[PDB]
Assembly symmetry: D3
Homo-oligomer: 323 residues x 6
């Protein structure tokens, strides 16, 4: 079958000048995210709960209200769990469904199931509601350049349901949404009418955000096949510093360090990885000090870190997509 | 209900009187089937071939033109074969997609891949071009009563792609279409919005027709869980003989002869049966004398047996559906 | 390289004469069974229910009132199901637990979980309340002969929990207690202190009673490796018939006619067969006409068919042990 | 062009006249097989035993003394068992190795592991010393016709090691030589230098003799894709009886009653069957009375049944190969 | 609720002052341990051997003399190996067996099977005779406080058999006792009478000691969900040293160096990890220099290193359990 | 089963004195390797191409022209791929084929399948043409010592076919040759006549060379059970620097630094690892900058870096082999 699944190994970015970096900082507003994107997600939203549904509708509405021509799919499936059968729904948002190639941004939108311990509620502020909102604030900041789309390439956003275990982390109790999605795409022909290629082959790179929002994260190099693109993240971070385009930020503790981790952490990327999709995994090591506590809330977030990461990220999408 | 997947076990048919049987004998014509439903499907149509596309467009068009509100689904997927990657397309036809339960009729519409041996072209007339044409005819002859649907139970037809092996019969080279749809159905919630039940649960019974069109066929009783529904066929056959609505037919050359065998044959029922679906398997034993030869063609069919079979089956479906 | 797990292949019976065939027929009370062993078990007793614990107490108490030295064990375990984790309990009854070899009688004591269709309650009278009671009637009727055991050979009874599916028959929704117990016997040293042999290797023959109680049952002959013990049953039947020790019985309608089936019927035997245990499987084909309906009750049972099989089976066992 | 694995679907015999049949008939010697081929095999020969090396040597020595250009090969491998790691050797003997297609005849040559019960030694006369002898007498009796082989087709012979279990029949304790050899042939290119076909595709048909030599055998017809070759066997037995070329033989106790089956019997054909090879399985139902007893010895063989079957089979083979 | 398995996620220690830390230090003797707990283990004890029954008897006796209320269970099973079927026996010693939650400490008590290279005998002093004596020394020194137990939480000890490969490390040749025991616990309702939780859910934290006793060991921090418990270890090691309670101890060569390691090391925790149990894995990297040689003996042990570790570990256990 | 598989764990090196360590430096020619061994291999040689047959023939011809007497075998096999069934051929070179034990050197010889991007052809200079030529220079630069073999230890070379994925990396699409050859060795008794041991038991240490040729490579230490042999590399390296036998080499730019990675990195060692062969894996992290681009050519290799590696690797082998 034709060889376009080769193209990703050759793709190169389109680097921005100093005047165009400045524009991007001005383009992005954390407090608008904080109020209109982030806060309506800080709620109990484990799979099947009335919060899951509220959260899915809020995410849909914030996207529909943009100009860029986004196509939305709800992917609804039944799976077995320790508490029996349950239904889940991944949310998928695509620009130019027909293009063979897509850069993919992903996170998970469910929150881990718990009882109401010490009369509190778990709402996973780093895990992973901030990541969702940064995705929502990216589509809005760049809705202008993203509309200039009506190398055959576009953009895609995935919001997984069921990342967390219900009872005890095992292969059969975790990653419900990503295991189903990776298989579905492996067996769907792409582009439409193709005879020998699939939607997976169409994934250019998968950028997974997990556990973002705490102060002083450090993100390692996990994989040697995406090393060259993690390196671009460094150089983007370092240049926006010397232009003092970031806040409360220092070059002595940079977010993207130069030390490969070696092993891997279990997460939504795994069913994609083992079928040959390239992955850039933006999960910090160590895990926030609040990980899986009633104190992963709005109060412990750190407004400045998030605002820096929104900026670097927004540039990487823009240079990858030659926009 | 929670609940309702229980009902198929207690369903009981609405047996028809002598006046009505006569009505339906008169209501179907085998000569119409032959010219407009069968002969267009006597063609080379192995997966991915031009005739596969043409077999599909015909089957669609014959249905698109009836009264009853049939909903057509095209299930197009990518699998691996001994020759590499290939695309298949199953055809599904449904009255009242929302009903919890559907009685299901099915066959395979691919022909088997062969070189052109002796300058002849294999076209599978019993295997399975007739079967498609009997299902096509049936929906035409009862379009009348089937439209009355506008015991929460309606009717579905399935036309599989890729039942035959490409090179050598094995678990990875066979039943490409049935193995896809079973998995898709078992992981889809039914009825829309359900939490603990699936489309697979909604399959009241599966009647798979295969290898049909030769004279003096004999079909054994394959499974002890659908046994009673096969006794029905025996008694529908024995009441059209005595009424004189069958042709060139005797009660010593009967088609359904309470026998056993008593083991199992591999076919499109296998991936449904191993997840708990009840099966009525309408495949003869022995196979037709012409099985898999260049002489399994139009000339070797028997007009009479196919007309008889049509009559019995059109009965069964009306008595099953209480119409 | 030991040794004894082969003794079971050379084993021969020690046949009874006419006067012992008459004594055996007069020592068993079809009336005593029906009231003291069977009727207490015709209730709703699906896994986890109040009825399950009541059936376990009835079975244990009836066995304890006997003089023979029966040793009883409760094998309680945890398993996943379509509705979640749940607890199950098999019942094991063994004479001479230390012996190397044991003949095994077995059936399942649960009832299938149904809703109350037409304000009725499923109780599974042939499925399998009667085989439970036949097992209790054999232990009573022969109590005098069996307390003589104090070849290294003896007798065991097993009553499985969780034989039926909870929702839809699959490999993961069926045969809960037999899949569990087989894995546990395969991994247990037998006899005590042994270095290279297991309890599973000590099962001489597994005689599984299922779906018994209706009149005119035809029991097929399933496996080549256990054929000669089926042939014992035929001759036993025939020579009791021909001393007038049977009732409402004709040689023209025997229970054990020879008739090879060839394939399998899913059941509690499957996890032991798969490991090389020889199986004598007493399940008729076709299934009782009342199978998985609310008329599987006391009023459709056949007193005399049952009484006849209690006699055949007691003769079989006494020959198997030389008693 | 390759492609050529379909040519076994279209192959047809060359039937021999009444004069060629008296020719074959007078051509075999049942006492010279008995003397020189069978008797040296009636010894203990479980795998790794000295009888195993002695048996392997007599088989090869007897083949090597014929004129036909027989190529001998020894397939020695290691494998894990209930008593630990052990070494086995299959014997493969082939005419025209370069030919794309071969008709295959086979049995197993090991005898089952037992201890000396009652001071006797198990030799498996029917199981399977006689089939071994039949294969050798066939290759001598037809030596001058096969020497003519110099349709691209010829003849292969196979003797398997490690068929029987050591301790308890299971997927890992049984069929050691056949499970090895099937996976080897499926991963060897054939013919030499071929790019997309394998030695397994060149097996035209697998003819597996097992448990033969007892009087009055009844052989089923197990598979639909070889039923036309069961037929030919049925017809060869009929013609030979009507020319009075059989002995002590009755058309009422004919070996090939057409009644069928049913399901399956595990044997050396299963690793090949499961991958698409057609099989004519000449195991009888039921098994001899002496099956797996110390009485499966020379005395209980029936000379006349074997002689008759020798003749039938050599006529089957000559007609398969057009000689 | 039925939700208690979430409790261990919220558990916090009760941190001891400096005069309680001084009592702990004074409360443990390395020479009593050396003479009465360690030395009798420095023998040959691979599975099945006389030294294995002797180490079992010594472990049980030394616990049976303490005042605390330990319940001892011997878990004995069969398994297949490169040499055939063999019997194994784990050792489980439990306080308050009815309590829902248990902090678990563990090592393997077998020794690796070797020939006597150079007329010397392999006794695995670090591998793992020392870890066993550390566990016995801790039960003795904390005996009076462990007596308080009579937060539903107590203490359990596990000695695994069959950790080493007999022949070549493979999924089937290694971790014989721990794979058996994790599967057993996973299917055992806990607490007694429970309906949807297991003994495996009861394990609060699995602290696994292995390859201990050589000088200057570096333990990494392998897992993100047990990392807050690794930090407790470092804090304990820092305080004891600045109070002057360590020996021959440098804060430039502290045992717990917050350096992380992504590559898993296979060991007895793996069957628990993959079912969701949190692990604090105390194995050093690199392995000791003497690893799997005849020089892993008593003279190459370092007295001071082991005495420091006893003290760090008993402080852990008291702060975990609030004594 | 004998004990000799233990011998590898005790084996120790026989180190060289400053003066033999110059004889090595001086007996290897980077310029002869570059022209006579490398350049012939810098062509398109993906599996089945004309370039693959020619690279077999180069490799063999170079080895056949040397005094030591190497035994060559060509291991051909058939496997399924994303484009269909294909033929592949490993190259295996052994001294003393019958010795119990062998040290093993290896790489892959196939070149990744790519379309001709920008009119350029992928030839994989580091991936892995240079590892091939390195293995060719070593046998030549040492031909004279290795002829003293005619401690049951010798040397083996292995050049795999089919390492790269044809389309997308996955367990079914990568490592065709290694997966195939580890299974064949595990099922081959070694030495000849052996009853309990395999060819795979004989592999002392597997040293896999991959992705070599770039400047300034950093090779990590992957596995605790092969660490002692990496320390030998690190030490060999440092004394060659001190003696001045190294070019363009510093100590801050050490090839073998103290660096512990997580592990894997999929490659040809995986299928051996899962069966317990110990592995020395000489692949760097990060991968070279040119990896899987058209600039992985002759111009971007570094002569010094490769010359220095030839010197280390050659010492290591003579020290390992006591030559
Ligand atoms: O800790 S994990 O490796 C899962 C695991 C695997 C094995 C044993 C115990 C736990 N990964 C993980 C867990 C929770 C998360 N929440 C957000 N991202 C998460 C990622
Ligand atoms: O028919 S079965 O093969 C179950 C089955 C198999 C395949 C598909 C769907 C259902 N065996 C069965 C069913 C009910 C029973 N009650 C007592 N013994 C029973 C045995
Ligand atoms: O009976 S079998 O199906 C194997 C089996 C299957 C399941 C359980 C126990 C045994 N076939 C078999 C057994 C022994 C033979 N000896 C010569 N040919 C033989 C064929
Ligand atoms: O990157 S790898 O871990 C394989 C992989 C795994 C998952 C996804 C994509 C690719 N190993 C690898 C790749 C290329 C090589 N070329 C020479 N040796 C190589 C080894
Ligand atoms: O080295 S391991 O990772 C196992 C292994 C994995 C792959 C190949 C060969 C061996 N773990 C191991 C080995 C020996 C031990 N002795 C005590 N604990 C031990 C742990
Ligand atoms: Zn989380
Ligand atoms: Zn067909
Ligand atoms: Zn039932
Ligand atoms: Zn046998
Ligand atoms: Zn060890
Ligand atoms: Zn590569």
């Amino acid at each position: 079958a034709s060889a376009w699944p080769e193209e990703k190994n050759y793709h190169q970015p389109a680097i921005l000048n100093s005047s165009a970096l400045r524009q991007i900082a001005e383009g992005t507003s954390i407090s608008e995210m904080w109020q209109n994107d982030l806060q309506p997600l800080l709620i109990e939203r484990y799979p099947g709960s009335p919060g899951s549904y509220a959260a899915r509708q809020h995410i849909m509405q914030r996207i529909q209200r943009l100009q860029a021509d986004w196509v939305l799919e709800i992917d609804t499936f039944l799976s077995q769990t320790p508490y029996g059968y349950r239904s889940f729904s991944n949310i998928i948002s695509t620009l130019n469904p027909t293009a063979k190639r897509h850069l993919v941004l992903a996170c998970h939108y469910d929150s881990k199931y718990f009882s109401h311990w010490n009369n509190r509620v778990f709402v996973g502020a780093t895990d992973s509601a901030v990541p969702c909102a940064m995705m929502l604030e990216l589509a809005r900041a760049l809705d202008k350049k993203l509309l200039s789309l009506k190398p055959d390439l576009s953009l895609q956003l995935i919001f997984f349901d069921g990342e967390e275990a219900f009872l005890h982390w095992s292969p059969q109790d975790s990653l419900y949404g990503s295991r189903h999605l990776a298989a579905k795409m492996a067996s769907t022909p792409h582009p439409p009418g193709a005879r020998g290629t699939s939607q997976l082959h169409g994934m250019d790179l998968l950028v997974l955000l997990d556990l973002i929002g705490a102060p002083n994260p450090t993100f390692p190099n996990f994989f040697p096949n995406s090393a060259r693109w993690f390196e671009r993240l460094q150089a983007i971070e370092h240049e926006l510093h010397e232009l003092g385009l970031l806040k409360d930020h220092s070059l002595e503790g940079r977010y993207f360090q130069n030390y490969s981790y070696g092993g891997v952490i279990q997460d939504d990327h795994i069913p994609f990885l083992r079928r040959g999709v390239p992955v850039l995994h933006l999960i910090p090591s160590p895990f926030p000090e609040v990980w899986h506590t009633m104190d992963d809330n709005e109060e412990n977030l750190d407004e400045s870190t998030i605002d820096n990461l929104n900026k670097i990220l927004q540039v990487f999408v823009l240079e990858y997509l030659h926009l």
